[PDB]
Design a binder for these strands. Structure first.
Lengths: 32, 242, 93, 198
RNA sequence: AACUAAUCCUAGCCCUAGCCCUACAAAUAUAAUUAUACUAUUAUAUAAAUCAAAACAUUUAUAAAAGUAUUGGAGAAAGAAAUUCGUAAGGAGCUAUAGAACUAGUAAAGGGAAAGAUGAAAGACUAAUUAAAAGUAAGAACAAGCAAAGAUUAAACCUUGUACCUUUUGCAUAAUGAACUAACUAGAAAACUUCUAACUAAAAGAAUUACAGCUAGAAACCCCGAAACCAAAC
RNA sequence: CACCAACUUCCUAAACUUAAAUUGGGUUAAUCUAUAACUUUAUAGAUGCAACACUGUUAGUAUGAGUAACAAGAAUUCCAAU
C-alpha cells in the first residue's frame, strides 16, 4: 500500500458569509 | 441523534419556510424587527465602569433589567409603558428588614379619548403616563400613530393604529362624513403617517391572523380540467395557426 | 454448566492490511510538520472529547455543554439527573 | 422465514417454518432483476452438483434462495407410494441448484457462456453472450393451467372470441349511469334540497 | 450407547459517527370510532419537593483567567468577569439469565411477560451430538456409629477422629444461615509524596513552576435492604 | 531397683526456629487487542476476568410422598333402551 497524503489545511484569508446560519457569531465580529 | 439546528433555530426555520416566506415583505419586516420598549421602572447604569471584585480594578459594566409584567388587559387598553412588577420587597427599603411578597400595582384607569381620524370617542383602560404622552403627542391620534408598538404596549392601540393608518392611506371618505373639507384637514394634519394600503392592512396583525389571512389570500378554487384543457387546446391551436 | 459439542470454524486474520500496516502513520505530524498541526488535532470522535480527557463527571458535564441544545428533551432531563448522582459521588465521597 | 423447495404457505412449508421457528437465517446474495438471467424453460448447464456438466431446462425458480430447479437433473432417489401393503416405487426427485451452479447455453454452440443483458430493437431485454455474442431468445413455456389459448373450446358462460374483442364504446360526455338512463329511459324530476357539506 | 436432560447461533440490542427536520370500504371526538340536526366549543401557573446541610429554618451546581476572588445558618456549598483565545460508518460493546422491557408494549391511572435452534436439498420419511448438572435406573440393605483416615490378604470388623460458614473472644454440646444442580451476584477518584524517565538555570506543543528545578508515566478509597417525604395523574 | 512415654533432643537425608487487625514483596486462572505462535503457546496493552453464603435473582430437579387428598341408586331386553 501507499500511505495517504499528509493532511493539508486551506491557506489564505477566508471571509465568513454573514447570512449563513451555520457561521458562528464571533466569526462575524469586527474583532474577527 | 442530535438535531443539526438548535431548538431556537426551529422557529427561525419555520419563519423562513412555507407560507411564512410567502407573507408580504413589508409585514415580514415589521415582525422581524424588534424595538425595545421605553424603560419606565428601571434605569440603565449611568456609568460604564465599576470595580471588579476578583482583581479590584475598574471594569466594564452590565445592566440587569427589572422584571415588569404587562397583563393582557394592557393589550386591550392603552397603557403608557406602565406595568405590574411582581417579586419580593424588603420592608422599609433596608436589607436588614423582613422579606415580604409584594405585587406593585401602577394606578390603572378607564378613560375616554377623542380620535380625529376616527371621529369617535373611545373609552379605554389608560394610565396617567399615557395621558401626558397624548398631550405631548399633540393629540390622541398622534400618540397612537407616533408611538411604536412596544412603547404603545397595546394590541388595541396597534389595532387602532392599523385603522388610522388605513384611513390615512386610502383617503377614505369615512373620515368626518358629510364634511369633505374637514376630512382633508385631518388627512393633511396626519399626512406624515400616510402609507401604502397593503402595509397598513398588516400593521398590528397577530401571527395566527397573518397566517390565516395569507392562506385566505392564496386559497383558490380548483380549476375544472375542462377549462384548463380548453385554454391549453386553444393555445396549441393558436400556435399552430401561426 | 455445559459446553459446545461442535468446534468453531477456523479463522485467518491478515496482520498486514492497510489499516494495521499504516497504523500510527503521520503521528509525528507536529515535529515533522513544523508543529503547524498538533497530533491532538488528528483525533476524530465525539465532539466534547476531541483532544480532551477528564473524569466521568467532567466528561458528562462537557458532553452536556457541547450538545445540550441539540440533545433530546428526554435525554437532557436524564442527563441532568445522572449528573446529580455523579457530582455527589465524586464531590462528597 | 427460510424459503425452501416447498411452496410458501404449503403444509410442508408450515412444517419447515412453524410460527415459533427462529432458526439461524440463511443469507442469500441479493440479485437484481437486471442481474438475474435464469428463467423457467431456459436451457442451462450445471457448473457443479450431482449432474454437473449436464444441460437442462429450468422448470422452477425460487429467486428468494437463488435456486434454479432442473427437471430430471440434480436428482436423488425417493420412494413413491410407500404403504403398508407395498414398499413403494423409487422415483426421481430433483434438488435445487443455486444460480452460480448453472450457466446459460448458447443455442448454436452448446457451452456455458457468460451472458450480458442488453436491449433489442423491440426494446425487450435479451441476454447476450460475453464471448461469441449471440441473442438467447426467451424460451417458450406452456400455460400453467395446461390450456393452449387457441385450442381452448368455449364452455358454458364463456363469451365467444369475437364478442370479447368487439368495441362498442363511443366517446361521449356521459357516464355509465347517465348512459344507462338514456338506453332504458329512466327519468327523475325530483331534486334534493340544499345540503351543507361539512 | 439409559431415562429425565443437555447441546447450538442469530432474534436483536448498545455506544459514538453521520444525519436534523421542512413526506380498503365503512365509522369516528355525540357516549370518539353510533351513516343526518340535539348540547356550543378548550389546554396551561415560580416547577416543587425529595435531596445536601449527618436534624432543620436562609440556603443546596445539575479555550484560558479559575474552581481563584467574591457569595453563603461564611456551612453544605455557590461562583462570574476584565483581558486573551477559538475558520474545517465504526466499537480491545452484548450474543437468548447477556444486549433495548421486547420475538412485544404483544400476552382505571398504570403495571407488564414467557420463548427459538436438521440439512445443500424434506418434490432427500426431520438432523445429529453428550462415561457430560442435580434427579433416577441398570445394581436395596447386613452388629460399630460427622462416615474419613492409617491401613490391610480382605468392602464391613482393628485403630484414630466433638459437620461447615458467620459470629461471638484467640471457647462452643452456644447462636445464626444452607433440599440439591446450573447461571448470575459487591472497591470507583491523584492535592501532595516516593518510584520510572526526558531536558536542565531552565522545563512543559499558549494560560505552569523555578536560587535544581520542571515535564511525562505509574501509584486510591464496594454491593443489597427501611419506616418515611413530595409533585403530578387516576 | 528398671521400663514406658512428646519432632524436646540425637540419628540418615534436609532444615536453621514457635498467636492476629495491620504493612512490604513475588506469582497466577480467564477474556479481548497489538505482534507472534499453529494439538493450543509467547511478549506487550487491556477488562462486564475466578462466589458453599447480599430477607440475593432465574431455571432445572429432589425430599415430605405415591403420603394428605379426592368419586357414580338397582336389574335388564340397553347412554337420547325399558
Amino acid at each position: 500500500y501507499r500511505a495517504p497524503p499528509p493532511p493539508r489545511r486551506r491557506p489564505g484569508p477566508h471571509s465568513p458569509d454573514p447570512e449563513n446560519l451555520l457561521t458562528p457569531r464571533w466569526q462575524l465580529t469586527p474583532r474577527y | 441523534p442530535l438535531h443539526r439546528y438548535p431548538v431556537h433555530l426551529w422557529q427561525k426555520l419555520r419563519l423562513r419556510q412555507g407560507i411564512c416566506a410567502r407573507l408580504p415583505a413589508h409585514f415580514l419586516r415589521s415582525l422581524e424587527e424588534e424595538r425595545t420598549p421605553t424603560p419606565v421602572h428601571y434605569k440603565p447604569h449611568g456609568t460604564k465602569f465599576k470595580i471588579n471584585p476578583k482583581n479590584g480594578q475598574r471594569e466594564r459594566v452590565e445592566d440587569v433589567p427589572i422584571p415588569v409584567h404587562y397583563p393582557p388587559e394592557s393589550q386591550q387598553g392603552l397603557w403608557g409603558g406602565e406595568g405590574l412588577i411582581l417579586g419580593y420587597r424588603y420592608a422599609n427599603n433596608d436589607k436588614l428588614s423582613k422579606r415580604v411578597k409584594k405585587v406593585w400595582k401602577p394606578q390603572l384607569f378607564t378613560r375616554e379619548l377623542y380620535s380625529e381620524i376616527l371621529d369617535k370617542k373611545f373609552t379605554v383602560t389608560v394610565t396617567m403616563r399615557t395621558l401626558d404622552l397624548i398631550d405631548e403627542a399633540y393629540g390622541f391620534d398622534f400618540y397612537i400613530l407616533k408611538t411604536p408598538k412596544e412603547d404603545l404596549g397595546s394590541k388595541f392601540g396597534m389595532d387602532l393604529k392599523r385603522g388610522m393608518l388605513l384611513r390615512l392611506a386610502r383617503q377614505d371618505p369615512h373620515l368626518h362624513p358629510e364634511n369633505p373639507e374637514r376630512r382633508a384637514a385631518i388627512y393633511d394634519k396626519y399626512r406624515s403617517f400616510v402609507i401604502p394600503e397593503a402595509e397598513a392592512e398588516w400593521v398590528g396583525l397577530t401571527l395566527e391572523e397573518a397566517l390565516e389571512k395569507q392562506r385566505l389570500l392564496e386559497e383558490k378554487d380548483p380549476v375544472p380540467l375542462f377549462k384548463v384543457y380548453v385554454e391549453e387546446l386553444v393555445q396549441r391551436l393558436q400556435e399552430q395557426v401561426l | 454448566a455445559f459446553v459446545r459439542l461442535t468446534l468453531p470454524p477456523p479463522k485467518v486474520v491478515d496482520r498486514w492490511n492497510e489499516k494495521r500496516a499504516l497504523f500510527g502513520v503521520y503521528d509525528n505530524i507536529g515535529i515533522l510538520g513544523n508543529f503547524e498541526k498538533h497530533p491532538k488535532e488528528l483525533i476524530k470522535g465525539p465532539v466534547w472529547l476531541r483532544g480532551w480527557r477528564g473524569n466521568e463527571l467532567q466528561r458528562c458535564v462537557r458532553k452536556k455543554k457541547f450538545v445540550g441544545n441539540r440533545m433530546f428533551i428526554e435525554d437532557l432531563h436524564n442527563l441532568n439527573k445522572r449528573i446529580s448522582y455523579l457530582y455527589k459521588h465524586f464531590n462528597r465521597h | 422465514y427460510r424459503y425452501g423447495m416447498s411452496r410458501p404457505g404449503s403444509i410442508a412449508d408450515k412444517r419447515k417454518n412453524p410460527p415459533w421457528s427462529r432458526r439461524r437465517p440463511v443469507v442469500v446474495e441479493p440479485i437484481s432483476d437486471e442481474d438475474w438471467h435464469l428463467f423457467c424453460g431456459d436451457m442451462v448447464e450445471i457448473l457443479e452438483g450431482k449432474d454437473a456438466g449436464k444441460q437442462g431446462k429450468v422448470v422452477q425458480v425460487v429467486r428468494q434462495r437463488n435456486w434454479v430447479v432442473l427437471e430430471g437433473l440434480n436428482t436423488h432417489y425417493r420412494y413413491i407410494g410407500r404403504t403398508k401393503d407395498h414398499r413403494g416405487t423409487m422415483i426421481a426427485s430433483e434438488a435445487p441448484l443455486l444460480h452460480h451452479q448453472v450457466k446459460l447455453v448458447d443455442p448454436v454452440d452448446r457451452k456455458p457462456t457468460e451472458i450480458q443483458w442488453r436491449f433489442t430493437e423491440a426494446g425487450e431485454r435479451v441476454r447476450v453472450s460475453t464471448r461469441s455474442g449471440r441473442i438467447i431468445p426467451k424460451p417458450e413455456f406452456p400455460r400453467a393451467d395446461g390450456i393452449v389459448p387457441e385450442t381452448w373450446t368455449d364452455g358454458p358462460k364463456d363469451t365467444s372470441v369475437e364478442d370479447a374483442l368487439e368495441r362498442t364504446y363511443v366517446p361521449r360526455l356521459k357516464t355509465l349511469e347517465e348512459d344507462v338512463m338514456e338506453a332504458m329511459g329512466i327519468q327523475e324530476t325530483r331534486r334534493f334540497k340544499k345540503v351543507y357539506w361539512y
